Design a protein around this ligand. Structure first.
Ligand SMILES: [Mg+2]
Length: 303
């Protein structure tokens, strides 16, 4: 038996890679030792006439269906190989974290990069990928995964990871936009309020989202208002309501996050406060990124 096959040092290639194809003769011993090789790519003639065909700085042009015909010059028997299909692949690079997200204050943000080859094959088992992370004009690390330490409003921005193989010709990128989310308190709750028995109880805590720089593309932010009261000797605080609309003990919450009750009772005499929580909407899900708790108001129902 006298057979031939193409053996390759790569399963596929990325732009700028090198590779080598090898006509490999098999079968019963001794195998014919005086041989000519004729190579074709996609049915078209190739100039290379040696046992190995080598490519350097590959481009799309080097992809294609290779075949070698080997002739034994003693007998003149020629044997052609099955084609070896050499395909060009591209890197798909991904970040595990959301494309855009807000973070809570005083945290270290971990980012992870993942990579796949477009054709579901790596070029070779040991093939080496290079990672480079940057924010704007500065390289923040050369590792696949990185950590942004002590994230502050001035680290708001777009972080990008670039990945490539043997040549930067094969580079592909992913980006994520990360911003600090905090709240500002524009109007604190009143420190004390005395209310005529039978008249209206109305309390407000005015806070807003505090976001520095360009918020474009970032997750929708919402605020929810949690209202409490605690009376004398009373052990744990009563949560009056959370959602807008009506609430417990005759209290309602307006659309703006205001606490309201029609007519006071001597039982409404208590401390009130609000805990306002900031949420970012990511996919179908909502997650608190900040909170503000109001000063307690001493609510006196008299006369
Ligand atoms: Mg980790």
């Amino acid at each position: 038996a006298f057979t031939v096959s193409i053996q390759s040092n790569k399963r596929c290639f990325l732009a700028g890679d090198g590779f080598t194809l090898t006509a490999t003769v098999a079968g019963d011993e001794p195998l014919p030792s005086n041989l000519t090789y004729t190579w074709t790519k996609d049915d078209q003639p190739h100039e290379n006439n040696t046992a190995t065909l080598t490519v350097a700085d590959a481009t799309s042009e080097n992809a294609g269906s290779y075949k070698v015909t080997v002739q034994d010059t003693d007998t003149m028997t020629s044997v052609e190989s099955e084609v070896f299909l050499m395909e060009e692949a591209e890197l798909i690079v991904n970040i595990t974290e959301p494309q855009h997200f807000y973070v809570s204050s005083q945290t270290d943000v971990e980012l992870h990069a993942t990579v796949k080859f477009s054709g579901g094959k790596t070029p070779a088992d040991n093939y080496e990928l290079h990672y480079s992370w940057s924010k704007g004009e500065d390289v923040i690390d050369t590792t696949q995964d990185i950590t942004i330490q002590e994230f502050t409003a001035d680290k708001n921005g777009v972080y990008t990871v670039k990945v490539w193989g043997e040549s930067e010709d094969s580079a592909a990128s992913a980006s994520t936009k990360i911003m600090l989310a905090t709240m500002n308190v524009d109007q604190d709750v009143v420190e004390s309020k005395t209310v005529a028995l039978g008249n209206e109880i109305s309390l407000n805590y005015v806070v807003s989202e505090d976001i520095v720089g360009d918020s474009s593309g970032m997750p929708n932010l919402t605020i929810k208002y949690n209202w409490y009261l605690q009376r004398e000797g009373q052990l744990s605080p009563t949560l009056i309501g959370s959602e807008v609309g009506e609430a417990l003990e005759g209290f309602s919450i307006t659309p703006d996050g205001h606490l309201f009750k029609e007519s006071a009772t001597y039982d409404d005499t208590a401390k009130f406060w609000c805990v306002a929580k900031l949420y970012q909407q990511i996919e179908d899900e909502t997650v608190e990124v900040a909170a503000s708790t109001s000063r307690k108001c001493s609510m006196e129902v008299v006369k």
